[PDB]
Nucleic acid binder design. Structure first.
Ligand SMILES: Nc1ncnc2c1ncn2[C@@H]1O[C@H](COP(=O)(O)CP(=O)(O)OP(=O)(O)O)[C@@H](O)[C@H]1O
Ligand SMILES: Nc1ncnc2c1ncn2[C@@H]1O[C@H](COP(=O)(O)CP(=O)(O)OP(=O)(O)O)[C@@H](O)[C@H]1O
Ligand SMILES: [Mg+2]
Ligand SMILES: [Mg+2]
Ligand SMILES: [Mg+2]
Ligand SMILES: [Mg+2]
Length: 349
RNA sequence: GGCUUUUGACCUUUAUGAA
RNA sequence: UUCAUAAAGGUCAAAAGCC
């Protein structure tokens, strides 16, 4: 049945039956990703006399994190290009490389290698960050949607578990402040975003799937007037880190905890020191400034300039109205009708 | 306890692109 | 050598579903 009719003790069964990827979906998506990556490395940029080269194509998003929803999660690919040499360079020339990727895709389509359908683009967006399309192929048993983002390799060859050289963030901050573009270059650090989730406990990822499904259900009512989905993913990590830190926990208690955190968005000030910290005075000052913003502040662990909170209080107002409604559903209720109870939050300093 | 899936960790290999 | 995407082999763990 639907999530809103599902009692607390059946949440994990709901996640299993509807949210966890099945073998065909994830294998088909991987096959499509291989198709696109091979295209990006072996065909797409071979047209130019001055070799533009792909240093890496990173599978980011839920696909790289292992937090996908069965049959509903896209493939988010950040394609790093050697010719993009700075954040400035990325901001101004990403449109060029986007159009060229589009051109070569359409070229391959004519050759009947595969079929591509490009997104609505209702707003001009001014300067898009992604090339969004649906991929069809004779080898594929299903369509797969893609977000392809050209980017400057700010991190270089990155070691998992290594803190980035703070000078990289110093440069990021300079460029953002210069152009008034905070949060603009998160794509450069998608590896850090992925790394922040990739090795988390299996059940934490299942809870994230649940919250993401809840979020998408709310999207039915409130359209696109909600806070970023990524904000809810980070809020769930926060809930677990302050309230559980265990591999085995109650899914229902975690879910209620997140719903209650949404209600307290006016008091949320969340950040991490996973990839940066207050040691560097420039980075520390940037972090401090973000932490002084109107609530909620949910700072991207990968990007000290990115408040994933979004800065739109109306968006959190609407989400909280849904959180209030859902706290009355069977989801967080025991068999006797009582709430399972949220986690006791430990104060993080 | 048994079966399986999902999610990672570690060690190898191939194709491809890069440094 | 390293990094990336897919595939192949091996080991380890976590959670879940079912019995
Ligand atoms: N507001 C934001 N600020 C910074 N990074 C963001 C962001 N929104 C999305 N991202 C990054 O881009 C990735 C892909 O975004 P989306 O594809 O829109 C949702 P997702 O996290 O992949 O889950 P889903 O695609 O299964 O719904 C996210 O995982 C996140 O790393
Ligand atoms: N850092 C990142 N890593 C991986 N994927 C990302 C990413 N940032 C963005 N994406 C993907 O690329 C898509 C388009 O990127 P953007 O143009 O930045 C979203 P937007 O136009 O600001 O609309 P929004 O208000 O929904 O965020 C996102 O929906 C996301 O799926
Ligand atoms: Mg995605
Ligand atoms: Mg996407
Ligand atoms: Mg596996
Ligand atoms: Mg090789």
């Amino acid at each position: 049945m639907e999530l809103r009719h599902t009692p607390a003790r059946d949440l994990d069964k709901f996640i299993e039956d509807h949210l966890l990827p099945n073998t065909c979906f994830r294998t088909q998506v991987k096959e499509a990703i291989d198709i696109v990556c091979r295209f990006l490395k072996e065909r797409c940029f071979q047209g130019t006399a001055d070799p533009v080269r792909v240093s890496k194509v990173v599978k980011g998003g839920s696909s790289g994190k292992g937090t996908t929803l069965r049959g509903r999660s896209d493939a988010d690919l950040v394609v790093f290009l050697t010719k993009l040499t700075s954040f400035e360079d990325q901001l101004r020339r990403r449109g060029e490389f986007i159009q060229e990727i589009r051109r070569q895709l359409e070229a391959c389509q004519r050759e009947q290698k595969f079929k591509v359908t490009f997104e609505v683009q209702s707003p001009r967006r001014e300067n898009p960050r992604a090339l969004s399309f649906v991929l069809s192929s004779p080898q594929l048993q299903q369509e797969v949607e893609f977000d392809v983002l050209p980017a400057f390799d700010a991190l270089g060859q990155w070691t998992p578990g290594y803190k980035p050289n703070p000078e990289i963030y110093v440069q990021l901050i300079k460029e953002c402040k210069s152009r008034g573009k905070e949060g603009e270059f998160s794509t450069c650090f998608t590896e850090l975003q992925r790394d922040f989730l990739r090795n988390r406990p299996t059940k934490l990822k299942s809870l994230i799937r649940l919250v993401k499904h809840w979020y998408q259900t709310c999207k039915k009512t409130h359209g696109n007037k909600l806070p970023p989905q990524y904000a809810l993913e980070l809020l769930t990590v926060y809930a677990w880190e302050q309230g559980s830190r265990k591999t085995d926990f109650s899914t229902a208690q975690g879910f209620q905890t997140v719903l209650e955190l949404v209600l307290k968005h006016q008091k949320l000030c969340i950040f991490w020191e996973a990839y940066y910290d207050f040691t560097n005075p420039v980075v520390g000052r940037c972090m401090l400034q973000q932490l002084k913003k109107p609530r909620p502040v949910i700072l991207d662990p990968a990007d000290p300039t990115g408040n994933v909170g979004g800065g739109d209080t109306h968006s959190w107002q609407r989400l909280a109205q849904e959180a209030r409604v859902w706290l009355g559903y069977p989801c967080c209720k025991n068999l006797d009708g009582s709430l399972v109870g949220a986690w006791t939050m430990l104060q993080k300093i």
